[PDB]
């Protein structure tokens, strides 16, 4: 009934959040669904390297990896506030529904 999403940029922090979320719900013996992997969205920025004009037409193409991981749970929302309160991690953002 509640769909927990995990929006993270670095995979190292993302894989650690989805790990403790499954274990954090395992102690309540809940029928949880496995973590799914949404397609990674990269942000392309092709900027000219030179600050003004003079150069050899050199472009530096930046990228920004945005990873999304979903975990579906069907359980009442009575005591899930503390389950999310022990999921503190800088760099990641949890948006429960």
């Amino acid at each position: 009934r509640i769909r927990i999403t995990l929006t993270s940029r670095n995979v190292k922090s993302l894989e650690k959040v989805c790990a403790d979320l499954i274990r954090g719900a395992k102690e309540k013996s809940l029928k949880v669904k496995g973590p799914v992997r949404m397609p990674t969205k990269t942000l392309r920025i092709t900027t000219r390297k030179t600050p003004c004009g003079e150069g050899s037409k050199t472009w530096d193409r930046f990228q920004m990896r945005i990873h999304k991981r979903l975990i579906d749970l069907h359980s009442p929302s009575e005591i899930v506030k503390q389950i999310t309160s022990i999921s503190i991690e800088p760099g990641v953002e949890v948006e429960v529904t």
């Binding site: 942000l43 920025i45 900027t47 000219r48 390297k49 600050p51 530096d60 930046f62 920004m64």
Partner: protein, 49 residues
């Protein structure tokens, strides 16, 4: 008075750092100069690969 309507066209958008109207990068909601976005590219999260 002393307020001309400028909301559509070159002159309403400017860099949020150096207040310039050239080399703007407003895709994905940045609105930065092309010579200033490179200075903060590592801070935003954009890396070269």
């Amino acid at each position: 008075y002393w307020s001309h309507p400028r909301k559509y066209g070159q002159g309403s958008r400017s860099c949020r750092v150096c207040s310039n109207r050239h080399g703007l990068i407003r895709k994905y909601g940045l609105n930065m100069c092309r010579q200033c976005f490179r200075q903060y590219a590592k801070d935003i999260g954009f890396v070269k690969l």
